[PDB]
Amino acid sequence: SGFRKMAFPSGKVEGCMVQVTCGTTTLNGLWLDDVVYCPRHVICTSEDMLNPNYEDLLIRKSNHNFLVQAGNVQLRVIGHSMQNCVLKLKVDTANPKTPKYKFVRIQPGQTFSVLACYNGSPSGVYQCAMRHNFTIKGSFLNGSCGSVGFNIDYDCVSFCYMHHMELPTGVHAGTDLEGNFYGPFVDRQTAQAAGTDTTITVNVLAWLYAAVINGDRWFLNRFTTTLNDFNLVAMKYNYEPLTQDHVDILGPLSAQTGIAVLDMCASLKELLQNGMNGRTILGSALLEDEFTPFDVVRQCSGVTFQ
Amino acid sequence: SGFRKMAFPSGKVEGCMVQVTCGTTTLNGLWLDDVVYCPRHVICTSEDMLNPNYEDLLIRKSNHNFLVQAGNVQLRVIGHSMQNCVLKLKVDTANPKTPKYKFVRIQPGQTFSVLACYNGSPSGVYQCAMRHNFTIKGSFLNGSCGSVGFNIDYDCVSFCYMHHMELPTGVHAGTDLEGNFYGPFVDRQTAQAAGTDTTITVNVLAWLYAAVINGDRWFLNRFTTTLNDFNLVAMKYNYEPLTQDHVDILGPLSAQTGIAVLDMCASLKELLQNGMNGRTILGSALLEDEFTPFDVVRQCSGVTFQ
Ligand SMILES: *C(=N)[C@H](C[C@@H]1CCNC1=O)NC(=O)[C@@H]1[C@@H]2[C@H](CN1C(=O)[C@@H](NC(=O)C(F)(F)F)C(C)(C)C)C2(C)C
Ligand SMILES: *C(=N)[C@H](C[C@@H]1CCNC1=O)NC(=O)[C@@H]1[C@@H]2[C@H](CN1C(=O)[C@@H](NC(=O)C(F)(F)F)C(C)(C)C)C2(C)C
C-alpha cells in the first residue's frame, strides 16, 4: 500500500544527456542517435536575452562554434539547424545509449517526469503535470535549460518537454521536442506571465480513487449527482469541466473500487463546498490534481518498464 | 526557482536490479559485482510466512534452486549464504554495470530515494526519509520486496535500505544492505506495529529555509528564542528536540539567507502554536519534515552527479 509522487526511472534519459556550450553560454542537450537537441538561446549572450534575433545569431556561428561534451568525450558537430526554439546539432557519433524514443506533444493535465540537469549531468528527477495555463510547477535554476520531460511506455521513452525559461510566481515554461512552445510564450527576456490556472478535475477524482484503494474512505458520501450539476459547482471553484472522455478514462478506477464515477463526483462536490474540516486525504491537506488516472493505475498495480 | 520532492537519478541503480525466484516466490534482487542481494523470505512459501525458520529452510535449498534473471539472461548461482535478513547469492558473472557503491546504515531523519521494482524491473522512483520510529512512508505492493533505497555522492551510490514488509497504517519497514532491520521488526507475518513517530525538527527548519530562498517569507517574525525554550514547545507538539549538531548542520542555509537558526526557530514556534491560518508554505498546507538540509542545498544549488 501507500501512495507517493512516483517519477519514472531516469536511466534511459540519463544516457542521452550532454552538455552544450557556445561561447560562454552552457546548458543541457538531449543526445538521440547522431542529433543533439538543445534550447536555441545557447547562441545568445546575456545582452541578447532582451530582444534576440535567433536567425541572425545562428548565421554567425559554424559547426565548430558548438561545444558538445558527452561526459569526458567531446562530440564533433558536423551540422546544425534550427527548428522553432530548439537547435539540432548533428554529430559524427551516434549515441550508443539511445533508447526507443518518441516525440509527443502532451495536452494540459497530463503528467510527466522531469530530469533536472546542469552542465550535462543529472541533478534529480521529479514528476510534474502540464497545467491548463501551459506551465509546470517545476524546480529549475540557472543552467537547467535543456532538461527534458518524458514518459515511459514499456521500453519506449516519450519525450514531451524541454525547459526553456522561468515565469513569475516561480512557474516554468518550455517547448516540445519539435521546438514549439507550450502556450503563448516566447524565448526572450521580456514581460510575460501565465494565465489563470484551473484545477484538473479528472486528476483530482483519480487521486481520490487512490485514497479509496489505500483505505482512506472518510470523504465518501451516500449521494450521487449528474455530470451537469457537478460541473456547475466545479466552475465556481475554478475546476475544469468534466467531459465524458474524462469519465470513460476513469472507468478502470471506478470498476476496481466498485464506486461509480458520478458517485465520486458527489463526494468531491461536498469537499469543494465544505472543505476537509482539518482532515487529510492520503496525508495531504489539499486536493491533489497532479496524478493522472494512468498514474494511479500504474502506481497501484505495479506497472514496470523494460 | 521552485521546490519539489526531487529524487536521485536511478540510472546506476537500474542496472543492478535483477529478478530472484525460488520455487514459486519471486521478488527483486540487487546485483553488485558477482553477488546478488535479496530478502531472505524468497525461500518461504505462503505457509512459512507465519513462523518461518529461515536457517532451516536454507538447508533444503541448493545453488540451482535459486533462479536469477538479469533481463532476458539467467545468472548461474555458484554459492549462497545468509547474513541476517538478506541472502547473498554468488553468481558466475560479475555485473558490468556495477557502479562505485557503499553500504551505509542511515540514522532516523535522513532522506533517500527508493527505486520501486517488480519482477526485477523498475516501476518508479521516489524520495523518502527514515522516520524516528524506523519506518518509511513509501509505496509498495506484492512482489516489491528487494527494492533498495540509495543515496548518490558524485559517482558513489550509497545503498542504505532494502524493502522487506509492510506494517499497519500503510507504513513500511526494511533492513540495511547487511540485513539488519531498521527498528524492532522481524521478517515474519505476525502482529507488529510501529511506535509513535515524531516530526523531524531539523528537516522542518531546512524546508522553511527553502521557502525563504524561493520568496515565501510570510511566516518570518521579528522575534528570537533560545534552544531550550524552542525545544520545550517542540516537545508538546511531538517535535524532535533540536540539538547543537542540528543547528551546526543548518549553518550553510542560515548563512545563505541571512537568517539565524534561532530566529527561524522563533518563526517555527509561532507556526506550531498558531498554525498557518489557511496559508500555504511552498504550496503545502502542512509543515514538511522529509527534506534534509543537504536536500535543500542540493536542490537550491543544482548539485549534479556523475
Ligand atoms: C536556462 N538555463 C535558464 C533557467 C531559468 C533561469 C532560472 N530558472 C529557470 O528556469 N532559463 C533562462 O534564463 C530564460 C531564457 C532567457 C531568460 N529566462 C528566464 O527564465 C527569465 N524569465 C522570463 O524571461 C519570463 F519570466 F519573462 F518568462 C528570468 C528573468 C531569468 C526568470 C531566455 C532566453 C528567455
Ligand atoms: C514483498 N514482496 C512483500 C511486499 C509487502 C506486501 C504489500 N506491501 C508490502 O510492502 N512483503 C511481505 O509480504 C511481508 C513479508 C511477509 C509478510 N509481509 C507483510 O508486509 C505483511 N505485514 C506484516 O507482516 C506486519 F505488518 F506484521 F509487519 C502483510 C500482511 C503482507 C502486510 C514477511 C516474510 C514478513
XYZ file of N, CA, C and O in Angstrom, chain B residues 175-289:
460
model
N 15.482 -3.442 6.001
C 16.816 -3.615 6.546
C 17.817 -2.809 5.732
O 17.517 -2.306 4.647
N 19.021 -2.686 6.278
C 20.146 -2.188 5.504
C 20.610 -3.262 4.516
O 19.987 -4.315 4.362
N 21.707 -2.979 3.818
C 22.254 -3.956 2.887
C 23.024 -5.067 3.589
O 23.434 -6.030 2.931
N 23.231 -4.953 4.898
C 23.809 -6.015 5.708
C 22.747 -6.896 6.358
O 23.092 -7.773 7.155
N 21.472 -6.672 6.047
C 20.394 -7.498 6.548
C 19.843 -7.119 7.903
O 18.916 -7.784 8.382
N 20.364 -6.072 8.537
C 19.919 -5.680 9.868
C 18.689 -4.789 9.749
O 18.735 -3.742 9.095
N 17.598 -5.204 10.388
C 16.348 -4.462 10.312
C 16.483 -3.096 10.971
O 17.172 -2.940 11.982
N 15.822 -2.100 10.384
C 15.717 -0.780 10.997
C 14.585 -0.820 12.015
O 13.411 -0.917 11.643
N 14.930 -0.751 13.298
C 13.945 -0.805 14.352
C 13.680 -2.220 14.822
O 14.301 -3.179 14.355
N 12.745 -2.378 15.770
C 12.485 -3.692 16.375
C 11.477 -4.513 15.571
O 10.402 -4.883 16.058
N 11.832 -4.811 14.325
C 10.962 -5.524 13.405
C 11.628 -6.812 12.941
O 12.850 -6.865 12.768
N 10.818 -7.849 12.744
C 11.295 -9.144 12.279
C 10.559 -9.501 10.997
O 9.444 -9.033 10.743
N 11.199 -10.335 10.179
C 10.649 -10.712 8.876
C 9.784 -11.965 9.020
O 10.105 -13.054 8.538
N 8.659 -11.787 9.708
C 7.652 -12.833 9.815
C 6.279 -12.179 9.877
O 6.135 -11.044 10.339
N 5.270 -12.906 9.393
C 3.905 -12.386 9.308
C 3.220 -12.570 10.660
O 2.457 -13.511 10.892
N 3.506 -11.643 11.571
C 2.934 -11.647 12.910
C 2.435 -10.245 13.242
O 2.548 -9.314 12.439
N 1.879 -10.097 14.441
C 1.326 -8.819 14.887
C 2.472 -7.884 15.251
O 3.086 -8.013 16.313
N 2.767 -6.937 14.363
C 3.785 -5.926 14.597
C 3.215 -4.556 14.261
O 2.364 -4.421 13.377
N 3.689 -3.538 14.976
C 3.225 -2.177 14.757
C 4.343 -1.206 15.100
O 5.096 -1.426 16.052
N 4.443 -0.137 14.317
C 5.456 0.879 14.560
C 5.091 1.725 15.773
O 3.917 1.904 16.106
N 6.119 2.251 16.436
C 5.920 3.129 17.567
C 5.518 4.528 17.142
O 5.379 4.842 15.960
N 5.314 5.381 18.144
C 4.958 6.768 17.879
C 6.071 7.457 17.099
O 7.251 7.341 17.441
N 5.689 8.174 16.048
C 6.637 8.847 15.173
C 6.622 10.344 15.451
O 5.552 10.959 15.503
N 7.804 10.919 15.627
C 7.951 12.343 15.879
C 8.296 13.078 14.590
O 8.771 12.491 13.614
N 8.043 14.383 14.598
C 8.351 15.221 13.450
C 9.813 15.645 13.500
O 10.277 16.187 14.509
N 10.538 15.402 12.408
C 11.958 15.729 12.341
C 12.112 17.243 12.302
O 11.854 17.880 11.275
N 12.535 17.825 13.427
C 12.584 19.278 13.548
C 13.602 19.892 12.593
O 13.325 20.919 11.961
N 14.782 19.280 12.471
C 15.831 19.854 11.632
C 15.397 19.893 10.172
O 15.743 20.828 9.438
N 14.630 18.895 9.728
C 14.133 18.898 8.357
C 13.072 19.971 8.145
O 12.976 20.537 7.049
N 12.262 20.255 9.168
C 11.253 21.306 9.049
C 11.921 22.664 8.871
O 11.525 23.465 8.017
N 12.949 22.940 9.679
C 13.655 24.214 9.567
C 14.333 24.352 8.210
O 14.307 25.429 7.602
N 14.948 23.272 7.721
C 15.569 23.308 6.400
C 14.533 23.565 5.314
O 14.784 24.324 4.371
N 13.360 22.937 5.432
C 12.284 23.184 4.479
C 11.804 24.628 4.554
O 11.442 25.224 3.533
N 11.790 25.208 5.758
C 11.442 26.618 5.892
C 12.486 27.508 5.231
O 12.148 28.555 4.664
N 13.761 27.116 5.301
C 14.802 27.878 4.620
C 14.591 27.866 3.112
O 14.754 28.897 2.449
N 14.213 26.711 2.555
C 13.929 26.637 1.126
C 12.787 27.567 0.742
O 12.785 28.145 -0.352
N 11.802 27.722 1.630
C 10.720 28.668 1.376
C 11.242 30.097 1.299
O 10.815 30.878 0.439
N 12.165 30.460 2.194
C 12.737 31.802 2.175
C 13.546 32.023 0.902
O 13.495 33.100 0.295
N 14.305 31.009 0.475
C 15.063 31.120 -0.769
C 14.126 31.336 -1.950
O 14.439 32.087 -2.882
N 12.961 30.693 -1.928
C 12.006 30.781 -3.024
C 11.066 31.975 -2.908
O 10.192 32.138 -3.766
N 11.215 32.806 -1.877
C 10.440 34.022 -1.745
C 9.277 33.949 -0.778
O 8.695 34.993 -0.460
N 8.920 32.757 -0.304
C 7.830 32.594 0.656
C 8.372 32.936 2.039
O 8.963 32.101 2.725
N 8.175 34.192 2.452
C 8.707 34.695 3.715
C 7.621 35.268 4.619
O 7.919 36.090 5.492
N 6.365 34.852 4.435
C 5.281 35.416 5.235
C 5.340 34.951 6.684
O 4.848 35.650 7.578
N 5.934 33.785 6.941
C 5.954 33.215 8.282
C 7.066 33.774 9.160
O 7.100 33.463 10.355
N 7.970 34.579 8.608
C 9.080 35.103 9.391
C 8.595 36.194 10.338
O 7.910 37.134 9.920
N 8.953 36.073 11.612
C 8.614 37.062 12.624
C 9.861 37.855 13.010
O 10.963 37.620 12.505
N 9.675 38.806 13.922
C 10.747 39.681 14.373
C 11.364 39.229 15.690
O 12.170 39.962 16.269
N 11.010 38.042 16.174
C 11.456 37.558 17.470
C 12.529 36.489 17.314
O 12.706 35.897 16.246
N 13.249 36.254 18.407
C 14.227 35.183 18.512
C 13.905 34.347 19.743
O 13.033 34.693 20.544
N 14.613 33.230 19.887
C 14.392 32.345 21.020
C 15.660 31.549 21.289
O 16.543 31.439 20.436
N 15.742 31.006 22.499
C 16.837 30.126 22.872
C 16.525 28.694 22.453
O 15.380 28.340 22.161
N 17.571 27.867 22.420
C 17.391 26.469 22.044
C 16.498 25.738 23.040
O 15.641 24.938 22.645
N 16.685 25.998 24.337
C 15.886 25.322 25.355
C 14.415 25.711 25.257
O 13.531 24.848 25.324
N 14.133 27.007 25.098
C 12.747 27.460 25.027
C 12.036 26.884 23.810
O 10.871 26.477 23.897
N 12.721 26.849 22.664
C 12.122 26.279 21.463
C 11.849 24.790 21.636
O 10.803 24.290 21.206
N 12.779 24.067 22.262
C 12.612 22.626 22.412
C 11.428 22.292 23.313
O 10.702 21.327 23.051
N 11.204 23.087 24.365
C 10.081 22.825 25.262
C 8.751 22.907 24.523
O 7.863 22.071 24.732
N 8.593 23.909 23.658
C 7.399 23.985 22.823
C 7.374 22.831 21.829
O 6.311 22.276 21.525
N 8.544 22.447 21.312
C 8.617 21.357 20.345
C 8.173 20.034 20.959
O 7.542 19.209 20.286
N 8.493 19.810 22.238
C 8.093 18.568 22.893
C 6.577 18.436 22.959
O 6.037 17.332 22.818
N 5.871 19.550 23.173
C 4.415 19.496 23.269
C 3.788 19.026 21.962
O 2.815 18.263 21.969
N 4.333 19.468 20.828
C 3.782 19.152 19.517
C 4.458 17.950 18.865
O 4.434 17.829 17.636
N 5.049 17.058 19.665
C 5.687 15.838 19.162
C 6.765 16.151 18.124
O 6.848 15.514 17.073
N 7.595 17.146 18.420
C 8.722 17.510 17.577
C 10.017 17.058 18.237
O 10.180 17.190 19.456
N 10.928 16.518 17.435
C 12.197 16.052 17.969
C 12.999 17.227 18.522
O 13.013 18.308 17.921
N 13.657 17.061 19.668
C 14.477 18.148 20.213
C 15.587 18.532 19.247
O 16.180 17.682 18.579
N 15.864 19.831 19.177
C 16.879 20.361 18.274
C 18.211 20.419 19.012
O 18.392 21.239 19.919
N 19.138 19.548 18.626
C 20.455 19.519 19.236
C 21.362 20.567 18.594
O 21.029 21.182 17.577
N 22.527 20.774 19.214
C 23.507 21.693 18.645
C 24.040 21.186 17.311
O 24.379 21.990 16.435
N 24.116 19.865 17.137
C 24.562 19.310 15.863
C 23.606 19.685 14.738
O 24.037 19.992 13.621
N 22.300 19.661 15.016
C 21.321 20.088 14.020
C 21.495 21.562 13.675
O 21.373 21.953 12.507
N 21.773 22.398 14.679
C 21.989 23.821 14.430
C 23.211 24.028 13.546
O 23.179 24.814 12.590
N 24.306 23.324 13.847
C 25.515 23.452 13.038
C 25.297 22.948 11.619
O 25.872 23.496 10.672
N 24.481 21.905 11.453
C 24.189 21.386 10.121
C 23.413 22.415 9.305
O 23.651 22.584 8.103
N 22.488 23.129 9.944
C 21.699 24.162 9.282
C 22.483 25.446 9.029
O 21.894 26.431 8.570
N 23.784 25.456 9.314
C 24.601 26.638 9.172
C 24.641 27.228 7.774
O 24.404 28.427 7.589
N 24.965 26.413 6.762
C 25.004 26.952 5.389
C 23.694 27.576 4.942
O 23.706 28.603 4.250
N 22.557 26.984 5.314
C 21.270 27.587 4.983
C 21.073 28.903 5.724
O 20.549 29.868 5.158
N 21.485 28.956 6.992
C 21.373 30.193 7.758
C 22.247 31.291 7.165
O 21.830 32.452 7.086
N 23.462 30.942 6.740
C 24.368 31.942 6.185
C 23.882 32.448 4.833
O 24.007 33.640 4.529
N 23.332 31.558 4.004
C 22.903 31.955 2.666
C 21.747 32.948 2.726
O 21.754 33.966 2.024
N 20.749 32.674 3.565
C 19.559 33.509 3.646
C 19.716 34.696 4.586
O 18.852 35.578 4.594
N 20.788 34.742 5.373
C 20.964 35.829 6.314
C 20.045 35.780 7.510
O 19.833 36.806 8.160
N 19.489 34.612 7.822
C 18.584 34.436 8.950
C 19.223 33.456 9.922
O 19.614 32.351 9.528
N 19.326 33.858 11.186
C 19.901 32.990 12.199
C 19.018 31.767 12.421
O 17.800 31.807 12.219
N 19.652 30.667 12.834
C 18.919 29.427 13.079
C 17.892 29.630 14.185
O 16.740 29.187 14.074
N 18.290 30.311 15.264
C 17.370 30.566 16.368
C 16.248 31.517 15.964
O 15.133 31.413 16.490
N 16.519 32.451 15.048
C 15.456 33.307 14.531
C 14.422 32.488 13.768
O 13.213 32.722 13.896
N 14.878 31.524 12.966
C 13.955 30.639 12.266
C 13.205 29.733 13.235
O 12.071 29.331 12.953
N 13.822 29.397 14.372
C 13.133 28.601 15.382
C 11.982 29.379 16.007
O 10.932 28.802 16.315
N 12.165 30.685 16.214
C 11.078 31.514 16.727
C 9.913 31.558 15.747
O 8.746 31.516 16.154
N 10.211 31.652 14.448
C 9.157 31.607 13.439
C 8.445 30.260 13.449
O 7.219 30.196 13.298
N 9.199 29.170 13.614
C 8.583 27.849 13.687
C 7.738 27.704 14.947
O 6.694 27.041 14.927
N 8.175 28.313 16.052
C 7.409 28.241 17.292
C 6.040 28.889 17.134
O 5.036 28.369 17.635
N 5.981 30.031 16.443
C 4.699 30.681 16.196
C 3.800 29.812 15.326
O 2.589 29.722 15.565
N 4.375 29.165 14.309
C 3.584 28.309 13.430
C 3.004 27.124 14.191
O 1.856 26.729 13.958
N 3.786 26.537 15.099
C 3.286 25.416 15.889
C 2.149 25.846 16.807
O 1.173 25.107 16.983
N 2.255 27.037 17.401
C 1.260 27.479 18.372
C 0.033 28.100 17.715
O -1.072 27.991 18.259
N 0.194 28.748 16.560
C -0.901 29.473 15.931
C -1.383 28.855 14.626
O -2.469 29.216 14.158
N -0.621 27.944 14.028
C -0.999 27.372 12.753
C -0.693 28.306 11.598
O -0.143 29.397 11.757
N -1.065 27.857 10.400
C -0.844 28.639 9.192
C -2.013 29.549 8.844
O -1.879 30.379 7.937
N -3.145 29.417 9.540
C -4.326 30.252 9.306
C -4.756 30.213 7.841
O -5.055 31.240 7.230
N -4.777 29.010 7.271
C -5.209 28.819 5.904
C -4.183 29.158 4.847
O -4.494 29.057 3.653
N -2.977 29.554 5.237
C -1.927 29.873 4.284
C -1.069 28.642 4.006
O -1.020 27.696 4.796
N -0.392 28.665 2.863
C 0.466 27.570 2.440
C 1.909 28.046 2.348
O 2.178 29.209 2.033
N 2.834 27.136 2.635
C 4.263 27.390 2.509
C 4.796 26.474 1.419
O 4.707 25.244 1.533
N 5.343 27.073 0.358
C 5.820 26.332 -0.812
C 4.717 25.451 -1.396
O 4.970 24.345 -1.877
N 3.478 25.940 -1.343
C 2.341 25.209 -1.859
C 1.823 24.104 -0.967
O 0.889 23.396 -1.367
N 2.387 23.931 0.225
C 1.985 22.878 1.148
C 1.255 23.493 2.334
O 1.732 24.468 2.924
N 0.100 22.923 2.675
C -0.678 23.394 3.813
C -0.189 22.826 5.139
O -0.677 23.247 6.193
N 0.758 21.891 5.112
C 1.317 21.298 6.316
C 2.833 21.424 6.284
O 3.446 21.462 5.213
N 3.432 21.501 7.470
C 4.883 21.570 7.566
C 5.505 20.260 7.100
O 5.045 19.172 7.456
N 6.561 20.370 6.298
C 7.204 19.218 5.680
C 8.493 18.882 6.420
O 9.341 19.756 6.626
N 8.637 17.614 6.810
C 9.811 17.149 7.540
C 10.572 16.068 6.779
O 11.313 15.291 7.389
